[PDB]
Amino acid sequence: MQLSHRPAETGDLETVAGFPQDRDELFYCYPKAIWPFSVAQLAAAIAERRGSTVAVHDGQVLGFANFYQWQHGDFCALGNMMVAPAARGLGVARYLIGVMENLAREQYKARLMKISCFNANAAGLLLYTQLGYQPRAIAERHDPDGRRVALIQMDKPLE
């Protein structure tokens, strides 16, 4: 697909806040958020994070991601990774992750990208594996019902 990218803008918030289709999907990309997702919750994340970026195809915002950790010369950690349900499986996240890797390299001089993915999120785990991310550790977390889940902490060298 012909894809472009740019920093997220206020007009994009409504569309992006619509990407998570259920409580599980919101949990996977933003576990601190509370369902239902809202533009206020998205805007709050953007304001306390860095590098909020959208992927665009055929005039439609189809993907979003940002960094929740950024350490110059060291690493960035990617979060809020989400794609419009109708546009999944078409390379939008692959594209946007490539863009985010370049941004980490160029703006943060990062040697490493960290991505953490919840155990139930098979689509995420398989994506990051295909992009060359390796699992490093597993941490315990809790889901919104208080049930115990496993957070798979992965990384990839940059440059």
Side-chain angles (χ1 to χ4, degrees), residues 1 3-31 33-158:
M1 299 216 304
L3 286 158
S4 61
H5 67 91
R6 56 170 175 75
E9 291 174 5
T10 308
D12 306 325
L13 296 166
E14 163 267 321
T15 306
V16 175
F19 292 173
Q21 292 303 293
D22 59 28
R23 282 166 188 75
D24 291 344
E25 293 195 355
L26 182 59
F27 183 71
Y28 298 163
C29 69
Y30 196 169
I34 300 161
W35 184 270
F37 201 32
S38 67
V39 170
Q41 291 187 85
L42 179 58
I46 290 170
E48 71 189 351
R49 291 183 187 210
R50 298 291 184 274
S52 289
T53 305
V54 295
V56 175
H57 168 80
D58 190 27
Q60 307 295 315
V61 172
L62 303 182
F64 178 90
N66 56 36
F67 300 137
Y68 64 88
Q69 295 166 174
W70 54 93
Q71 294 294 327
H72 194 93
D74 197 355
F75 71 89
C76 296
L78 195 138
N80 288 168
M81 176 71 254
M82 54 184 101
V83 171
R88 287 173 193 174
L90 308 179
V92 175
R94 171 183 292 268
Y95 169 78
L96 188 52
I97 294 161
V99 169
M100 300 301 288
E101 291 169 351
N102 285 343
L103 182 64
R105 280 190 281 263
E106 290 155 36
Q107 183 173 329
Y108 296 97
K109 297 299 189 273
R111 269 72 150 175
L112 192 79
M113 184 79 79
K114 296 187 188 188
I115 304 179
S116 296
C117 187
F118 287 99
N119 69 279
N121 190 7
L125 293 167
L126 294 172
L127 171 56
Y128 310 129
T129 299
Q130 287 312 113
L131 301 180
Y133 289 78
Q134 288 178 235
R136 298 294 177 195
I138 303 183
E140 186 177 283
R141 294 290 189 267
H142 293 73
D143 80 6
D145 299 303
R147 301 189 170 100
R148 297 154 74 188
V149 296
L151 182 64
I152 311 307
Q153 301 171 131
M154 314 179 68
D155 67 18
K156 180 188 169 168
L158 307 176

